[PDB]
Amino acid sequence: NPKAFPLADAALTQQILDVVQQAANLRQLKKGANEATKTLNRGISEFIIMAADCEPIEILLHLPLLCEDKNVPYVFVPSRVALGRACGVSRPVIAASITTNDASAIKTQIYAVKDKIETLL
Amino acid sequence: AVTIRTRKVISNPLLARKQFVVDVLHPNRANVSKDELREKLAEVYKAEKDAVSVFGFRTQFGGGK
């Protein structure tokens, strides 16, 4: 019913906010909306995370359109402040993307959350 | 710097001494000679140098200790 949908519960945000951090450390993370847009055009994203408190929220809703067109999972986290902190950047982040790499060291838990996010959808 | 630490200290008045295990950390240095240790131990325990014996030193693989 809300434009923000689906919204992960408090537990799931923790595992989602987990994966993004190692992705940032492993250079497997793209931060910010326009980067997230680009990755969808190249089709190099497992899934993309968004903040539900984005000011305004309509700005990031174009990302859902791309994924469901491209059959990519997506999810919303309650706080952009928290999401940016996990991303490792000193500024709030409204949208982030995990890049495709079957050769990631953090492959296993990405597919783990990629399973839960799909169930959420 | 070089740091010297003593552990498992057992007073042995029967032999009239104190026995213990020496752990020396020496970053950026090959190792420490026995005389240098005996010096440090002598000031640490407030005893004469001649009353200090040190032996059986093995540096860990990779160095530094």
Partner: protein
């Protein structure tokens, strides 16, 4: 006139002062050595008068003050000499502050009725950028990137500063002159917290490389490295003995180091909203542990980003007591801003009730050594003071100080006066943005300043 006689003279004068002040003499002498016995021996929380505290918020020059450090001289019983570096500094209280503007500033806080007065400062900049680009050549006299933390040597002879520039310079307290530069020797070992061993020269530094660095300030030489944290080490605290306690941030694990034995104790919270809600039949999952202050040699407290203040005992891995949402819930976003739709009801639907709401973070958490009281800080706009139970099994809210407005980066407490009657002054560095980064939305009324509050004891 041998030194033993001098000690005898100083000891004799010391006893005469105690006799003039006053069974009682025997008790005070025991208290003079209570610190060696690592137990809480300072029960004065009930005697504190929060309501009559004289609050003041002295501002400062630089933007985004990151840390403050206070130096209090203490008389040494073993030699009967004050910790003051020089005769001029006898009974002079000093506070040192740094910001993200690469400037270290010292202030004089001897007078509680009066307020901190600037004495000297040193400012860094692009002049100090290293040309070599190899780490070990990071021996430049000044800062060239943000400053995060400060520690003042208990001898009052040195103050040490660190930040995101992967280095540690120690400055002379009197002139703020850099005497030595200690590179961290890691590409990503950026200093995050500095804690000194009380009444001692050992410094413990927590860095962004997941490691703790132990230094000897007099020898100006590195001693040992501590590995074992699985994420950045945000905070570190110490007391007279070498049990430094640290927090691993997103690893969500508080960790105590026995340096002499080369052994460590692991502490984890492990709280889940599901069980908490069922036992109730808004609780937020703890995200990271950002602050730690060790109340006692066998006890310590931590602050989480879910607004949870947790008490710990070395015997038990799990927290013994928890205070959920200590600083409250962040104000909800405005409906006129959440959505661009004209219809208000459409905008209200985007607020999603209370799901979006999140708690304040515990930006600061400080406990007075071996005492029954500790202070917490956030950007809620008020400093909360708590008292631990006599059994050290739970704590309660003693009061609040609403003078501070902005993020409470870091807190200190200083006391003055006679043993029975002691006046307590709380110094808290206040900024407009969080120390580690600029994530926080600009808080209305937030100001970059040092908050000061003098509290009196009566009863």
């Amino acid at each position: 006139e041998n030194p033993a006689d001098k000690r005898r003279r100083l000891a004799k004068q010391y006893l005469e002062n105690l006799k003039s002040e006053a069974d009682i003499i025997a008790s005070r002498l025991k208290e003079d050595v209570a610190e060696q016995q690592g137990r809480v021996f300072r029960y004065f929380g009930d005697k504190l008068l929060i309501s009559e505290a004289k609050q003041s918020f002295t501002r400062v020059g630089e933007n985004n003050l990151t840390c403050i450090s206070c130096f209090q001289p203490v008389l040494n019983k073993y030699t009967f000499e004050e910790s003051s570096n020089g005769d001029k500094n006898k009974g002079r209280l000093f506070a040192y502050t740094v910001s993200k503007d690469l400037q270290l500033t010292k202030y004089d806080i001897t007078d509680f009725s009066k307020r901190p007065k600037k004495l000297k400062y040193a400012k860094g900049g692009a002049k100090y950028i290293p040309t070599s680009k190899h780490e070990y050549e990071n021996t430049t006299e000044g800062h060239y990137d943000e400053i995060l933390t400060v520690a003042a040597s208990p001898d009052g002879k040195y103050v040490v500063t660190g930040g995101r520039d992967r280095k540690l310079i120690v400055w002379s307290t009197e002139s703020l002159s850099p005497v030595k530069v200690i590179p961290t020797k890691d590409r990503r070992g950026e200093v995050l917290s500095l804690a000194f061993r009380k009444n001692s020269d050992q410094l413990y530094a927590s860095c962004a490389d997941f490691k703790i660095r132990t230094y000897s300030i007099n020898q100006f030489s590195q001693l040992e490295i501590l590995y074992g944290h699985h994420d950045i080490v945000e905070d570190i605290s110490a007391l007279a003995m070498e049990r430094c306690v640290t927090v691993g941030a997103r690893d969500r694990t508080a960790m105590l180091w026995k340096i002499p034995d080369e052994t460590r104790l692991t502490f984890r919270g492990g709280d889940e909203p599901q069980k908490l809600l069922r036992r109730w039949m808004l609780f937020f999952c703890e995200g990271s542990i950002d602050v730690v202050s060790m109340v006692d040699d066998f006890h310590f407290i931590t602050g989480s980003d879910n607004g949870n203040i947790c008490l710990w005992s070395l015997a038990k891995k799990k927290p013994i007591f928890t205070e959920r949402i200590a600083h409250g819930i962040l104000p909800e976003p405005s409906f006129n801003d959440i959505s661009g739709e004209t219809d208000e009801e459409l905008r209200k639907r985007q607020l999603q009730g209370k799901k979006l709401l999140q708690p304040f973070w515990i930006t600061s958490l400080y406990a007075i050594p071996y005492s029954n009281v500790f202070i917490s800080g956030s950007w809620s706009g008020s400093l909360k003071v708590w008292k631990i139970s006599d059994n050290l099994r739970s704590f309660e809210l003693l009061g609040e100080l609403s003078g501070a407005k902005g993020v409470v980066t870091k807190i200190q407490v200083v006391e003055s006066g006679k043993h029975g009657k002691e006046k307590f002054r709380i110094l808290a560095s206040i900024a407009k943005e969080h120390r580690l980064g600029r994530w926080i939305a600009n808080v209305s009324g937030a100001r970059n300043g040092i908050y000061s509050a003098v509290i009196d004891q009566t009863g």
